């Protein structure tokens, strides 16, 4: 009944296992659904951070989702737009008065959500001597102390600092910390069971780590150099990331649970980048593609097997969530690996979508 060629599930498992057997990556897991029903899910390999014997990789293993945290930040922003507390055309200076200066005074909330605010990829912690970057106002005043790379609406430039600002805006608008809002109005509201900004001590043994750095960050109470965890730092599982993708595919609903109105989701999944604008990723020119309100619309169509309209987001880790609304199809995966490799992160997407039938 899922209308999927299970011959491609065999290829997907052998593809991941072949890289595991060759030592390219330690573990891998995935979960795919059609019509809201999961029909295939597998966890492969073993993990260790360097201080442990290799433990099994399971489907409920907690793993940092990295850049996928931005998707949680995008939902939280739009919830406040639905409540009328925020507006996408609001200048950031109205909420953060430190932005009332040339260059920064032109930035609107819409520019941050779509990576068009002209911000660089990341702020520099080495040049921030004597400044507590974990403090909200000290981080903002040091941010506006650093020049902007481009003007607003000049180019698409992936920026970590953009979503850090949004997390601050959520905090100043709601009156609670960013992590408190997301945990209450998204994590607990969507019924996510294995998702935490900071994993409790009784569950840290079930968190997948693959490097010394990840073990150290797992035992910490803050982000190393950001006032919040809006751009990165969330820990989750396959099913919880799957629930988030399915909520988007159903336009804000997940059975009895509702996070966004359907008209809001249709706007988030809508291309928001003006045509002909250049795209940059980490100091390199990237191919022009659709981008919504924090949600990626590329890759889709073209030489890929994902139908046009497939929305997505990847995360450093690596991980990823892909959902094809035209096929009622969702695919999420964890591939913990030191450096990015398209053969492990992107290539399996060809194997998966090749299995869809009728
Ligand atoms: C499909 C692409 C992925 C290709 C980019 C990765 C290249 C690998 C190594 C490079 O040195 C850069 C890398 O280390 C730095 C990664 C920073 C954060 C990445 C995540 O936020 C995923 C973002 C995906 C967005 C667009 C895209 O287009 O993702």
Structural domain tally of the chain? 1
Q: Which has the closest alpha carbon to 326: 303, 358, 289?
A: 358
Count CB atoms within 10 A of the CB of residue 343. Answer: 12
What is the C-alpha R_g of the chain?
A: 20
Residue 49 lies in a domain: yes
Residue 43 lies in a domain: yes
CA of 89 to the centre of ligand 1 (A): 28
CA gap 265, 309 in Å, rounded: 13
Whose alpha carbon is nearest atom 7 of ligand 1? 340
3-state secondary structure of 105: helix
Residue 1 lies in a domain: no
Whose alpha carbon is nearest atom 6 of ligand 1? 340
CA of 67 to the centre of ligand 1 (A): 10
Whose alpha carbon is nearest atom 2 of ligand 1? 314
**φ/ψ (deg, to 5) at 47:** -130, 155
Residue 229 lies in a domain: yes
Ligand 1 surroundings by CB, under 6 angstroms: 67, 158, 281-282, 286, 314-316, 340
Contact between 78 and 264 under an 8 Å Cβ cutoff? The reply is: yes
Residue 96's CATH number = 3.40.710.10
CA of 314 to the centre of ligand 1 (A): 8
CA gap 168, 178 in Å, rounded: 7
Count CB atoms within 10 A of the CB of residue 329. Answer: 24
Q: Which residues contact 344 (CB under 8 A, 6 or more apart)?
A: 16, 19, 24, 25, 28, 318, 335, 337
Pocket test for ligand 1, best of 288, 316, 333 (most atoms within 8 A of CB): 316
Angle in degrees, CA 315, 37, 343, rounded to 5? 35
Residue 321 lies in a domain: yes
Q: 254 - beta bridge partners? A: 257
Residue 324 lies in a domain: yes
Cα 5 to Cα 260, 271, 347, distances in angstroms = 33, 32, 18
HSE-CB at 148 with a 13 A cutoff on CA atoms is 22
Q: Is 316 annotated as contributing to ligand binding?
A: yes
Q: Is 21 exposed, middle or buried (0-12, 13-18, 19+ CB in 10 A)?
A: exposed
Contact between 159 and 73 under an 8 Å Cβ cutoff? The reply is: no
Residue 104 lies in a domain: yes
Whose alpha carbon is nearest atom 10 of ligand 1? 340
Q: Is 160 annotated as contributing to ligand binding?
A: yes
Q: Is 171 annotated as contributing to ligand binding?
A: no
Contact between 349 and 304 under an 8 Å Cβ cutoff? The reply is: yes
3-state secondary structure of 215: helix
Q: Is 158 annotated as contributing to ligand binding?
A: yes
Residue 71 lies in a domain: yes
CA of 111 to the centre of ligand 1 (A): 20
Range of the domain at 23: 6-354
Range list of H helices, the chain: 6-21, 69-82, 92-95, 109-113, 136-143, 160-174, 178-182, 212-218, 238-249, 262-268, 342-345, 347-353
Atom of ligand 1 nearest to the CA of 346: 1
Stretch (H or E) spanning 30: strand 27-34
Pocket test for ligand 1, best of 68, 279, 283, 314 (most atoms within 8 A of CB): 314
DSSP secondary structure, 156-183, as one string: EE--HHHHHHHHHHHHHHHSS-HHHHHI
């Amino acid at each position: 009944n899922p209308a999927f060629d299970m011959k491609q599930i065999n290829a997907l498992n052998g593809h991941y296992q072949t890289m595991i057997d060759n030592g390219d990556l330690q573990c891998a897991s995935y979960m795919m659904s059609r019509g809201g029903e999961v029909f295939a899910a597998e966890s492969l390999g073993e993990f260790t951070g360097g201080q442990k014997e290799k433990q099994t990789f399971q489907l409920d293993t907690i793993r940092e989702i990295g850049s996928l945290t931005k998707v949680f930040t995008a939902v939280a922003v739009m919830q406040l737009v639905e409540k009328g507390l925020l507006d996408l055309k609001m200048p950031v200076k109205l909420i953060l008065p430190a932005f009332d200066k040339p260059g920064f005074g032109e930035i609107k909330i819409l520019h941050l959500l779509t990576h068009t605010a002209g911000l660089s990829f990341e702020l520099d912690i080495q040049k921030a001597e004597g400044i507590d970057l974990t403090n909200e106002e000290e981080w903002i005043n040091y941010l506006v102390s650093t020049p902007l790379e481009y003007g607003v609406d000049e180019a698409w430039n992936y920026s970590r600092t953009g979503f850090v600002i949004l997390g601050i805006i959520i905090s100043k608008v709601t009156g609670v910390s960013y992590e408190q809002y997301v945990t209450k109005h998204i994590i607990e509201a969507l019924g996510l069971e294995r998702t935490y900004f900071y994993v409790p001590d009784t569950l840290k043994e079930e968190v997948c780590v693959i490097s010394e750095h990840e073990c150290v960050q797992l035992e910490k109470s803050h982000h190393p150099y950001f006032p919040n965890k809006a751009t990165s730092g969330l820990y989750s599982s396959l099913r919880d990331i799957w629930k988030l993708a399915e909520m988007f595919r159903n336009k804000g609903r997940l059975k009895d649970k509702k996070l966004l109105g359907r008209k809001t989701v249709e706007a988030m999944l809508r291309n928001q980048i003006k045509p002909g604008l250049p795209f940059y990723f980490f100091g390199a020119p990237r191919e022009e593609g659709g981008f919504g309100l924090g949600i990626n619309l590329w890759p889709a169509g073209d030489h890929y097997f994902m139908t046009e309209g497939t929305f997505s987001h990847l995360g450093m880790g690596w991980c990823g969530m892909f959902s094809d609304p035209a096929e009622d199809f969702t695919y999420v995966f964890f591939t913990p690996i030191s450096e990015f490799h398209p053969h492990a992160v992107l290539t399996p997407l060809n194997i998966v979508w090749a299995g869809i039938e009728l």
